[PDB]
PDB file of C-alpha atoms and ligand atoms in Angstrom:
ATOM      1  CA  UNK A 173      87.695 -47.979 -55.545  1.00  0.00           C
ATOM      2  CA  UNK A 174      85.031 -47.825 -57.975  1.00  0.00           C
ATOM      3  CA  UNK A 175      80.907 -48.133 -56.177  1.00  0.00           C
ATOM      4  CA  UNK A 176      80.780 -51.144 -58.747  1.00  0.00           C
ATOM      5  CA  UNK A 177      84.485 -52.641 -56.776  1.00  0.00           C
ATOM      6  CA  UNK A 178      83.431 -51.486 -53.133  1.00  0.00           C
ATOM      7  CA  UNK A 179      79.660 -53.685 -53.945  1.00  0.00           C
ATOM      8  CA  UNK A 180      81.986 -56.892 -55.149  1.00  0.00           C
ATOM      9  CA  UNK A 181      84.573 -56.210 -52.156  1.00  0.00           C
ATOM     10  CA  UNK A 182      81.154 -56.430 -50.347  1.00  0.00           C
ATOM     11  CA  UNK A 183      80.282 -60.054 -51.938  1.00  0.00           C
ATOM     12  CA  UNK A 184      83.876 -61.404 -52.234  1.00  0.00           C
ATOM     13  CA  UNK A 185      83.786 -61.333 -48.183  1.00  0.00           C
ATOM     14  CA  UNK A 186      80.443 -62.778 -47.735  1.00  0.00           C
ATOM     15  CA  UNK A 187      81.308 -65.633 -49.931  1.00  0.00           C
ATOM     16  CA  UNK A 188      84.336 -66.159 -48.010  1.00  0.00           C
ATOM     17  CA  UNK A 189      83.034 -65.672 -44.500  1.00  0.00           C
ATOM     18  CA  UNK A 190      80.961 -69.063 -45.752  1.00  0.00           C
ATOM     19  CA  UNK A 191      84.175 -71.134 -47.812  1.00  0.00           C
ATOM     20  CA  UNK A 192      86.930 -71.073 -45.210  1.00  0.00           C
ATOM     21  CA  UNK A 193      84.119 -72.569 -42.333  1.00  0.00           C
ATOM     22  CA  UNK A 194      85.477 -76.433 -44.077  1.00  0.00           C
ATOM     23  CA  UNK A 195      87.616 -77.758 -46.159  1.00  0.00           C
ATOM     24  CA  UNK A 196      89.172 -75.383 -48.620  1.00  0.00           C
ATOM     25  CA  UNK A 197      89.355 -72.026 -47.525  1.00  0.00           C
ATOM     26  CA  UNK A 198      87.583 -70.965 -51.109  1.00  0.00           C
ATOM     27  CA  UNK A 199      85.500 -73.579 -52.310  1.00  0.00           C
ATOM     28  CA  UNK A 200      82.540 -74.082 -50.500  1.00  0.00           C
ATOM     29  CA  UNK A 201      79.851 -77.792 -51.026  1.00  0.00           C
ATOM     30  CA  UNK A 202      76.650 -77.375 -52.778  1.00  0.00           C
ATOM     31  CA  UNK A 203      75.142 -78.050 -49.783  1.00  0.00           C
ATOM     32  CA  UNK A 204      76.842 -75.415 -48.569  1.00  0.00           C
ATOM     33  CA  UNK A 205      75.631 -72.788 -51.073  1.00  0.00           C
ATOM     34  CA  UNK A 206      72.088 -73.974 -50.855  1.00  0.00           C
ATOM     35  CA  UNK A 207      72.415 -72.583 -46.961  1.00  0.00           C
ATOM     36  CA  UNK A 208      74.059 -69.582 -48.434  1.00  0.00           C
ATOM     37  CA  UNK A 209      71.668 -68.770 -50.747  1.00  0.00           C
ATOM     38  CA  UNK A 210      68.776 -69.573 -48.328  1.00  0.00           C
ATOM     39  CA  UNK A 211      69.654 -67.109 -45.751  1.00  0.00           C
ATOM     40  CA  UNK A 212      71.533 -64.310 -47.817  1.00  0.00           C
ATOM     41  CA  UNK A 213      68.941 -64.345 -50.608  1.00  0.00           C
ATOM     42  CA  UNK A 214      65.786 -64.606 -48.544  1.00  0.00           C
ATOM     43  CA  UNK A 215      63.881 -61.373 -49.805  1.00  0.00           C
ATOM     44  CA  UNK A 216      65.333 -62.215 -53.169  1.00  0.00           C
ATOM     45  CA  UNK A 217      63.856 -65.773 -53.330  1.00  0.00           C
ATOM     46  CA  UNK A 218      60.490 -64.871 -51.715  1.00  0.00           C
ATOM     47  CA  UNK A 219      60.632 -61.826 -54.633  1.00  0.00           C
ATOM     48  CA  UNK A 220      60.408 -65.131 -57.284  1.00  0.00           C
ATOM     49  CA  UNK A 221      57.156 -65.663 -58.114  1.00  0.00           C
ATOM     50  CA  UNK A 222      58.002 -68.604 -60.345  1.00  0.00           C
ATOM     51  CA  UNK A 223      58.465 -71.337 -57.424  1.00  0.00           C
ATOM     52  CA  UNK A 224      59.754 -73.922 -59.835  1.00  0.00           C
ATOM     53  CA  UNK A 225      62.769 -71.586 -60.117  1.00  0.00           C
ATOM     54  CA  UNK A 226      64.417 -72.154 -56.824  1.00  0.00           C
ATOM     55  CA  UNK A 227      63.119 -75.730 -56.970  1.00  0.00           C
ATOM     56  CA  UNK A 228      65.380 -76.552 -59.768  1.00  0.00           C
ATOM     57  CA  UNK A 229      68.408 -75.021 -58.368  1.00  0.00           C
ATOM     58  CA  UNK A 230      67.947 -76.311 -55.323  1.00  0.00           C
ATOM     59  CA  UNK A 231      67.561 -80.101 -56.673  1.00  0.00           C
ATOM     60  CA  UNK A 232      71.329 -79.733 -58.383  1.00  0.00           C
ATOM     61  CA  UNK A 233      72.433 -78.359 -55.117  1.00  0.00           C
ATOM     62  CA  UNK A 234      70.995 -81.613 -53.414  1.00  0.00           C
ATOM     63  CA  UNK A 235      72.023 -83.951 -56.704  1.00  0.00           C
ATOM     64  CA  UNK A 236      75.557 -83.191 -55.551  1.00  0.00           C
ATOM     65  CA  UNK A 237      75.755 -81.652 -52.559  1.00  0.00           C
ATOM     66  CA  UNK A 238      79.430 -82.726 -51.630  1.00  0.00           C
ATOM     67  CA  UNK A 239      80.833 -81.101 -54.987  1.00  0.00           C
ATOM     68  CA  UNK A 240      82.781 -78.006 -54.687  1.00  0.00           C
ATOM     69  CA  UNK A 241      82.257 -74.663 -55.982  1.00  0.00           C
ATOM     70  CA  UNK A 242      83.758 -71.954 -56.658  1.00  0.00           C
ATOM     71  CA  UNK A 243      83.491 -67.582 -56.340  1.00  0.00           C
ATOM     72  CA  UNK A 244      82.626 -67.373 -60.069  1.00  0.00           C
ATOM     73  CA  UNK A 245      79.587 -70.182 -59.583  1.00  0.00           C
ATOM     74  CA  UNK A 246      78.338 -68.997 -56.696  1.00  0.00           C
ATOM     75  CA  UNK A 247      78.294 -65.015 -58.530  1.00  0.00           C
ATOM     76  CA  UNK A 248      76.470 -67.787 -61.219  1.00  0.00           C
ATOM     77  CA  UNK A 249      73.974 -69.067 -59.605  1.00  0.00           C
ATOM     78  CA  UNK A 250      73.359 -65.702 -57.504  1.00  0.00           C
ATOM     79  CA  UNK A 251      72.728 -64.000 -61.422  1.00  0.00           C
ATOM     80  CA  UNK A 252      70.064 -66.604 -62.037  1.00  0.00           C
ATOM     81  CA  UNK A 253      67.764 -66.282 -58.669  1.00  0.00           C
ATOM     82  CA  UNK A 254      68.825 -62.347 -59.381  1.00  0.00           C
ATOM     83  CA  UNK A 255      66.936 -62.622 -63.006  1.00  0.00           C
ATOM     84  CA  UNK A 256      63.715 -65.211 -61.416  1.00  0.00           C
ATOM     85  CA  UNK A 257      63.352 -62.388 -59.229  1.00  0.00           C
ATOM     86  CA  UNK A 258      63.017 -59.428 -61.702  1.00  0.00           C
ATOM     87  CA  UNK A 259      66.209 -58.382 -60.064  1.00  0.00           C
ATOM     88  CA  UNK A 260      63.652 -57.454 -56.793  1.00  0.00           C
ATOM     89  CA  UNK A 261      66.135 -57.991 -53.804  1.00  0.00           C
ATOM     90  CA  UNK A 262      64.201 -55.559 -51.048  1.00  0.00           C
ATOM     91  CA  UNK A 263      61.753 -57.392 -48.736  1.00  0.00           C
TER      92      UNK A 263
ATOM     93  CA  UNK B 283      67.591 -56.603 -47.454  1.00  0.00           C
ATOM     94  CA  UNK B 284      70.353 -58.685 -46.489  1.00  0.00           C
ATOM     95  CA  UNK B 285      74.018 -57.192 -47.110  1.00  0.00           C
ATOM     96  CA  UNK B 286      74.502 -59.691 -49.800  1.00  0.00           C
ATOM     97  CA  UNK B 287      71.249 -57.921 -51.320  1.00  0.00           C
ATOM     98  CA  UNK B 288      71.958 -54.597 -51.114  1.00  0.00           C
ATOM     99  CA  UNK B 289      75.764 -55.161 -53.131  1.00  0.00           C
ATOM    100  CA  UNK B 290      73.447 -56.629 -56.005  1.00  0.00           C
ATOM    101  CA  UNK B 291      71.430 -53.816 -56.054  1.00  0.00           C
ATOM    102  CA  UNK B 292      74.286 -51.466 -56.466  1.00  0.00           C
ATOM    103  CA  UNK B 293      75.712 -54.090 -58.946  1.00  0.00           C
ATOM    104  CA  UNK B 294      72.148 -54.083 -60.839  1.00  0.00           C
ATOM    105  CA  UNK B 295      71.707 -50.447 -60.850  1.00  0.00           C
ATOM    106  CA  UNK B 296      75.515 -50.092 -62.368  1.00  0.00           C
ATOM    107  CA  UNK B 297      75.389 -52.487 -65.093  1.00  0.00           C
ATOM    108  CA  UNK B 298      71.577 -51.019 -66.588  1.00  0.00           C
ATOM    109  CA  UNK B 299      72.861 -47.090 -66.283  1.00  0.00           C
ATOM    110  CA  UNK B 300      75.059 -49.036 -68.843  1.00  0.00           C
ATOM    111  CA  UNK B 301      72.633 -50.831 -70.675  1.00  0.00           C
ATOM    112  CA  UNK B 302      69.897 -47.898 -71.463  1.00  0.00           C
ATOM    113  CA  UNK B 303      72.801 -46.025 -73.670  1.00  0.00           C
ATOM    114  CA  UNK B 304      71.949 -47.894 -76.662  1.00  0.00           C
ATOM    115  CA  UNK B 305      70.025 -50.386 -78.727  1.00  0.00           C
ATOM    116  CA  UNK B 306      68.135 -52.537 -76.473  1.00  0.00           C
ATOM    117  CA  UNK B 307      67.282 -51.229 -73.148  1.00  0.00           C
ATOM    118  CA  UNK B 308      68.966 -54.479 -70.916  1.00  0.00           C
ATOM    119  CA  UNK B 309      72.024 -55.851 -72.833  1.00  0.00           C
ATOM    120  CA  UNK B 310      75.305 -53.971 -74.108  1.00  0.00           C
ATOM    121  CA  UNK B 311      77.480 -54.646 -76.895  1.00  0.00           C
ATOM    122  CA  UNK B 312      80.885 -56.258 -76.040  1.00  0.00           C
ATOM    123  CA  UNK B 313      82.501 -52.788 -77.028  1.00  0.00           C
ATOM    124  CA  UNK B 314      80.537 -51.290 -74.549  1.00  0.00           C
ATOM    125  CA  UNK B 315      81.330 -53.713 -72.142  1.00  0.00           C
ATOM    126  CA  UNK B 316      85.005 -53.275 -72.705  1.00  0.00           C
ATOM    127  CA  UNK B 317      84.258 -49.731 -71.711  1.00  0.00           C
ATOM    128  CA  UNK B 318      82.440 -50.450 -68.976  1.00  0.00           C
ATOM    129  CA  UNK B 319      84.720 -52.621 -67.518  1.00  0.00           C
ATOM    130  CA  UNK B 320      88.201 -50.778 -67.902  1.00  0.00           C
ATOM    131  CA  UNK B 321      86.544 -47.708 -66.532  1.00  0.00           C
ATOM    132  CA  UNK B 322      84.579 -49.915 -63.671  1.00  0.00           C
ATOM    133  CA  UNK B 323      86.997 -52.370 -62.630  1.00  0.00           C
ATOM    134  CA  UNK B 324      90.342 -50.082 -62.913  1.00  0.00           C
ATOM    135  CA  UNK B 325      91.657 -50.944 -60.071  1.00  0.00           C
ATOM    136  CA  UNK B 326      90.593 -54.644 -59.721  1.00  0.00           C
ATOM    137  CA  UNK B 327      92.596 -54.967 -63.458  1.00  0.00           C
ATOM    138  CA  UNK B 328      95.836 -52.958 -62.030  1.00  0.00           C
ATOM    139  CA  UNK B 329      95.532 -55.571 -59.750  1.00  0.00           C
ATOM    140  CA  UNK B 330      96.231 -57.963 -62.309  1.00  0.00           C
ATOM    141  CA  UNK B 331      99.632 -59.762 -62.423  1.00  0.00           C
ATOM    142  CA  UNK B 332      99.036 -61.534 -65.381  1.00  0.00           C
ATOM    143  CA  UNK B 333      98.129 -58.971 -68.101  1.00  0.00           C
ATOM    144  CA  UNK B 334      97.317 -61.906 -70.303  1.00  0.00           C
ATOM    145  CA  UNK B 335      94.753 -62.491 -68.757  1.00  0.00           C
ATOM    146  CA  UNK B 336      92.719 -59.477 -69.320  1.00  0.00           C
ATOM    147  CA  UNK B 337      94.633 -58.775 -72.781  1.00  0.00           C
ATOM    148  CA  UNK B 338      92.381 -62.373 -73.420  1.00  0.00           C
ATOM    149  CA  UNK B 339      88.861 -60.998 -72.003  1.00  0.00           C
ATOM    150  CA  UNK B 340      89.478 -57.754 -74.263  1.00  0.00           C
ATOM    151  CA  UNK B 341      90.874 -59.745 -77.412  1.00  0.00           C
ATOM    152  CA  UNK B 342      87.143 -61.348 -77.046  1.00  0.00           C
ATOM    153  CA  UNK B 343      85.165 -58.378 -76.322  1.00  0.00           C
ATOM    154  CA  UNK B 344      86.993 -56.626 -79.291  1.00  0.00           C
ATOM    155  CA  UNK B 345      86.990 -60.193 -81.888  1.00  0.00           C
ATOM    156  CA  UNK B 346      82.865 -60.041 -81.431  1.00  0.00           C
ATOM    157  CA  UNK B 347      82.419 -55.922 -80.401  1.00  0.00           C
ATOM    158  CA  UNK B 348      79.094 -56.033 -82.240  1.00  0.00           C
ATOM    159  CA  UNK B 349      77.739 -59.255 -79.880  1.00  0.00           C
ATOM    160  CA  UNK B 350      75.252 -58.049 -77.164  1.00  0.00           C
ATOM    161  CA  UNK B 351      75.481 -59.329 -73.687  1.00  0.00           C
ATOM    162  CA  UNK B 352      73.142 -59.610 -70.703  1.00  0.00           C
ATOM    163  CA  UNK B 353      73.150 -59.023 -67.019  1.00  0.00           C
ATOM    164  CA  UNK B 354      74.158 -62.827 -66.890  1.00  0.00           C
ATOM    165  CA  UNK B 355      77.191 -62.524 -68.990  1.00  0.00           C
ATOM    166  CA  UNK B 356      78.414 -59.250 -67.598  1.00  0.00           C
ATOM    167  CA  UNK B 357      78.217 -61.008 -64.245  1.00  0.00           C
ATOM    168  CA  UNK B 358      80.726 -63.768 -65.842  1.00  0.00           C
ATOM    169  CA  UNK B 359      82.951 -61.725 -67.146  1.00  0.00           C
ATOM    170  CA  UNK B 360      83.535 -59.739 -64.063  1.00  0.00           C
ATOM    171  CA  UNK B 361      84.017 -62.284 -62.054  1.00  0.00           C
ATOM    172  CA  UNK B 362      86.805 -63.779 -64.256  1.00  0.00           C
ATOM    173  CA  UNK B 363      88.764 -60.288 -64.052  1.00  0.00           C
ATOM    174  CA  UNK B 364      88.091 -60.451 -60.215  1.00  0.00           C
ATOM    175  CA  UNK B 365      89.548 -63.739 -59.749  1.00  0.00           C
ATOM    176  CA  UNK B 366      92.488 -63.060 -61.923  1.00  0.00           C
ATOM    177  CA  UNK B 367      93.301 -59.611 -59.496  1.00  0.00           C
ATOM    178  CA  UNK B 368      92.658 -62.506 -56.628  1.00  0.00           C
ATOM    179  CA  UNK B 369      89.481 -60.812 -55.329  1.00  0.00           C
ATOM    180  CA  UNK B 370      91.346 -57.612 -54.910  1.00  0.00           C
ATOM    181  CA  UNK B 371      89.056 -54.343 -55.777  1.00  0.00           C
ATOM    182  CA  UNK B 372      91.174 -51.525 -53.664  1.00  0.00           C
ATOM    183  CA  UNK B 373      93.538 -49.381 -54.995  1.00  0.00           C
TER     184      UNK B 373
HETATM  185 NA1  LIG C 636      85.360 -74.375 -47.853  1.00  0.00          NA
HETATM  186 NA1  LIG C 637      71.712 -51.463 -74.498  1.00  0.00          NA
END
């Protein structure tokens, strides 16, 4: 594989180490992706030095927190915390 | 960093040793992310059972070659191919 397909083999099995724990095996909740991002982008979100940032993502998270979402929102959102952050994901 | 973390940093790194060719130092054109992604993802779009499907993302990419994309967007479009090979990256 390609560095750029070994980094997304990477990613594809975090994100599904988190969707198959309920309901369908590839969809995980909102609520579910707010713990996901918590813990997996922790140096990444302290790295944001525009709080409001995470705030905001975090309140649609919690505004529907039983909706389902998918690999290619999760990769999404992950771009936009990614850009708050100047793309600074090191502690 | 996290594990999550250090697969976006490859993934970062990737798509700007891209971006610096030309023009603007963090977008591409959609030509040059055509190239980058049938040299990037080859095996992910071998993968591919429906050729439509990336014969679709390329129609795009060449309809609007002169259009200049972001991190964001590259992120997007990758994704789509990668759900479309069903996650699969290895050759
Ligand atoms: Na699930
Ligand atoms: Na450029």
């Amino acid at each position: 594989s390609t560095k750029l397909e070994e980094h997304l083999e990477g990613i594809v099995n975090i994100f599904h180490q988190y969707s198959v724990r309920k309901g369908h095996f590839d969809t995980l909740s909102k609520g579910e992706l707010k713990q996901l991002l918590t813990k997996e982008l922790a140096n990444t979100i302290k790295n944001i030095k525009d709080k409001a940032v995470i705030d905001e993502i975090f309140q649609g998270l919690d505004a529907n927190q039983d909706e389902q979402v998918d690999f290619q929102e999760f990769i999404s959102m992950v771009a936009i915390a990614l850009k708050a952050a100047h793309y600074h994901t090191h502690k």
